[PDB]
Amino acid sequence: ARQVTIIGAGLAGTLVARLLARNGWQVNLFERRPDPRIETGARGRSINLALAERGAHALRLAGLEREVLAEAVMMRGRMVHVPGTPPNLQPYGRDDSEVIWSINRDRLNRILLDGAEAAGASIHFNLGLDSVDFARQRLTLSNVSGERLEKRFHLLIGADGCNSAVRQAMASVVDLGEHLETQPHGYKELQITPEASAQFNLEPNALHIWPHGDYMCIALPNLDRSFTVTLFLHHQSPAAQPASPSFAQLVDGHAARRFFQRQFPDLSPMLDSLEQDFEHHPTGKLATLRLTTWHVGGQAVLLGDAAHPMVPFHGQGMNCALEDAVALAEHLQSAADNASALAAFTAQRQPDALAIQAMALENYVEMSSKVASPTYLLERELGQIMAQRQPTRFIPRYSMVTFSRLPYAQAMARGQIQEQLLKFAVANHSDLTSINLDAVEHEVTRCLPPL
Ligand SMILES: Cc1cc2nc3c(=O)[nH]c(=O)nc-3n(C[C@H](O)[C@H](O)[C@H](O)COP(=O)(O)OP(=O)(O)OC[C@H]3O[C@@H](n4cnc5c(N)ncnc54)[C@H](O)[C@@H]3O)c2cc1C
Ligand SMILES: O=C(Cc1nn[nH]n1)c1ccc(C2CCCCC2)cc1
Numbered sequence: 001a002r003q004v005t006i007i008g009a010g011l012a013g014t015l016v017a018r019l020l021a022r023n024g025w026q027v028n029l030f031e032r033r034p035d036p037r038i039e040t041g042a043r044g045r046s047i048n049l050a051l052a053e054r055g056a057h058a059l060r061l062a063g064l065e066r067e068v069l070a071e072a073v074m075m076r077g078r079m080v081h082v083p084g085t086p087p088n089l090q091p092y093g094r095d096d097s098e099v100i101w102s103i104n105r106d107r108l109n110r111i112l113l114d115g116a117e118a119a120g121a122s123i124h125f126n127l128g129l130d131s132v133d134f135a136r137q138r139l140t141l142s143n144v145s146g147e148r149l150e151k152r153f154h155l156l157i158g159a160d161g162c163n164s165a166v167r168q169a170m171a172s173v174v175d176l177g178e179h180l181e182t183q184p185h186g187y188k189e190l191q192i193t194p195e196a197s198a199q200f201n202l203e204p205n206a207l208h209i210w211p212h213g214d215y216m217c218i219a220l221p222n223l224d225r226s227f228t229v230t231l232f233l234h235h236q237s238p239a240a241q242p243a244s245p246s247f248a249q250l251v252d253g254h255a256a257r258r259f260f261q262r263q264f265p266d267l268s269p270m271l272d273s274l275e276q277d278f279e280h281h282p283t284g285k286l287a288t289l290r291l292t293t294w295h296v297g298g299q300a301v302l303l304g305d306a307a308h309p310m311v312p313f314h315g316q317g318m319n320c321a322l323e324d325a326v327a328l329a330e331h332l333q334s335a336a337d338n339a340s341a342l343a344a345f346t347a348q349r350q351p352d353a354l355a356i357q358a359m360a361l362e363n364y365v366e367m368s369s370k371v372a373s374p375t376y377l378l379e380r381e382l383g384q385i386m387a388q389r390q391p392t393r394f395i396p397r398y399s400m401v402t403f404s405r406l407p408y409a410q411a412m413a414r415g416q417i418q419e420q421l422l423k424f425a426v427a428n429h430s431d432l433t434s435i436n437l438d439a440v441e442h443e444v445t446r447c448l449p450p451l
């Protein structure tokens with residue numbers, strides 16, 4: 001039996017443990033945190049994630065999809081809150097079967113843990129990886145108090161998150177070629193209670209966005225009708241724009257409140273504990289981390305956030321993580337040896353991780369400044385016409401990322417061609433009446449191969 005050691009019982013680590021264990025691998029999975037299935041007196045505060053086709057299909061192959069969806073809230077469309085008009089629901093894709101699911105992270109983790117153990121994996125909690133010795137094939141683990149334990153390993157999978165100890169240990173034996181790109185936006189999570197969302201008739205079965213240019217709020221629903229609101233806002237004000245809103249200017253809850261009443265006046269009444277949340281929840285940091293290589297020979301490979309931290313603006317990090325786990329399990333299961341498997345995995349997935357990293361950055365502009373401009377409206381309306389006349393050629397980029405399993409690089413490449421097609425068609429035209437539709441359709445057929 002082939003043996004594998006996995007660091008991190010997060011989303012990618014637990015899924016890959018399930019897929020390998022049920023193929024007969026001996027799987028040991030080590031996790032720094034305690035087991036979240038052991039109930040304690042602490043008050044767990046878990047956020048929700050948007051689960052889409054790529055994540056859903058990976059769970060479907062694992063036999064876990066139905067269990068996960070039982071606990072998920074359907075989001076049928078995007079509820080855009082633009083000042084001056086009523087909130088406007090934009091359906092996802094073309095028909096009612098194209099939805100995103102809002103799923104609690106801790107519930108998903110528990111389901112995945114149960115699934116890995118049922119497939120035969122052994123999960124060891126309260127053991128955090130501290131270092132690796134690649135030449136002696138040993139690693140050092142330790143509990144919180146610092147007491148250390150050594151284990152031999154044969155194949156090591158670093159599924160240990162954006163601050164991966166495995167990636168750090170790989171920097172001893174190979175150049176990963178890391179480039180960290182910081183992001184000027186931080187984020188803060190605020191809460192809407194069920195009473196407040198019910199009192200203000202906030203739609204539960206939708207994803208809600210409050211665009212506002214260089215800042216914005218997003219809200220995902222929970223099963224109990226509460227919402228978690230995420231404010232994205234610059235850490236610091238730029239020197240050129242010294243009065244522009246930023247976190248540094250929101251020192252306490254009362255400034256926060258005046259900000260929301262002025263700039264989000266229909267959302268402010270719903271955030272009852274805006275003051276308290278603002279001061280006791282930490283401001284989070286966003287960053288994109290790109291690696292030229294993900295593995296060391298046949299000994300160790302990264303996946304998930306350990307491999308490609310990305311900004312959350314597409315809701316694709318977990319979706320990408322689950323899709324990585326599927327691909328890593330398939331390559332390991334079928335390769336001549338572990339070395340060939342890890343090379344072929346990195347070669348397949350690294351271009352795709354780059355593509356989704358780039359699309360997540362760009363999607364910030366789409367969500368916060370594009371959805372409210374006159375020019376983008378005309379293009380989106382021409383885009384839906386094109387999807388109807390050429391359905392296998394013109395597939396909107398958001399739809400290819402979110403509702404298909406087209407490799408992310410091909411989605412990006414086709415999206416760039418569509419974007420420039422729509423951009424030139426609508427330029428110097430104010431209405432849809434002055435646009436030659438068959439001209440645009442002819443460029444779809446000349447430039448977009450059918451799927
Ligand atoms: C605010 C926010 C919102 C997001 N929303 C979405 C969304 O809506 N949709 C989406 O698809 N993605 C979303 N993401 C991204 C998503 O959360 C991650 O991409 C996903 O969790 C990656 O899964 P993973 O298994 O790689 O890592 P994680 O889920 O982070 O798992 C890492 C695991 O490794 C463990 N670990 C860490 N260090 C060690 C160590 N030294 N030793 C042992 N164990 C260790 C951790 O305890 C944890 O269990 C969001 C991210 C953020 C920050
Ligand atoms: O699906 C998307 C992107 C989209 N654009 N237009 N429709 N939705 C999407 C984008 C972001 C999120 C998360 C990001 C972290 C904070 C919670 C919300 C979820 C999902």
Ligand SMILES: [Cl-]
Pocket residue numbers: 078090092398
């Ligand atoms: Cl959309």
Ligand SMILES: [Cl-]
Pocket residue numbers: 310311312313314315316317318
């Ligand atoms: Cl994400």
